[PDB]
Amino acid sequence: MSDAVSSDRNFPNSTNLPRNPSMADYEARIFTFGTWIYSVNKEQLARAGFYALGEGDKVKCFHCGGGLTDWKPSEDPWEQHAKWYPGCKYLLEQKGQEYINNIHLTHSLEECLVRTT
Ligand SMILES: CN[C@@H](C)C(=O)N[C@H](C(=O)N1CCC[C@H]1C(=O)N[C@@H]1CCCc2ccccc21)C(C)(C)C
Ligand SMILES: [Zn+2]
């Protein structure tokens, strides 16, 4: 009888809120990165599974590990992390192992644009 302790009922105690993305996720993550920028909105980068450690740029992956630093102009987090170390929970779960595997094998994205501009 695996009772576990996660999915049962709401209101854990009082402080533990449901989630509130635009309160402790979007602004929280970004707040750790800073107004500074490089490619896309730091929030997008964080959504994939990234979080700054106070210092600008220096950001590490969640759970899967692997610290990323010195990003490259115009780059997505999904493909980036997936290549360096494809082992994220939400990432793999999102588009399944099939999608993650596809990335780590051949070039993807940046296609179907009339005629490469
Ligand atoms: C172009 N793609 C970019 C993101 C990229 O590969 N950057 C590379 C990069 O950051 N790499 C290479 C493998 C390991 C990783 C790296 O140096 N990571 C450093 C190592 C020291 C500790 C630490 C802590 C928090 C965040 C990053 C790191 C590097 C520029 C150092 C070659
Ligand atoms: Zn990761």
Domains and CATH numbers, the chain: 1-117 (1.10.1170.10)
Instruction: Give the atom of ligand 1 at the shortest distance from the alpha carbon of 72.
Output: 1
| Cα–Cα nearest to 47, from 23, 30, 66 | 30
Element (DSSP H or E) covering residue 83: helix 77-84
**Three-state DSSP state, 89:** helix
Residue 63 to residue 85: CA distance in whole angstroms: 11
Q: Phi and psi (nearest 5°) for 53?
A: -100, 40
Residue 80 to residue 72: CA distance in whole angstroms: 10
**Three-state DSSP state, 114:** coil
Residue 67 CB–ligand 1 contact under 6 Å: yes
Residue 47 CB–ligand 1 contact under 6 Å: no
Using the mean position of ligand 1's atoms as its centre, give its distance from the Cα of residue 34 in Å: 19
Q: Whose CA is nearest to atom 28 of ligand 1?
A: 67
Does the annotation place 61 within a ligand binding site? Answer: yes
CA angle at 76 for the pair 46 and 104, rounded to the nearest 5°: 110
Q: Which residue has the tokens 């533990």?
A: 16
| Cα–Cα nearest to 33, from 63, 53, 60, 61 | 53
Structure tokens at 67: 């610290």
Q: Which residues pair with 50 in a beta bridge?
A: 61
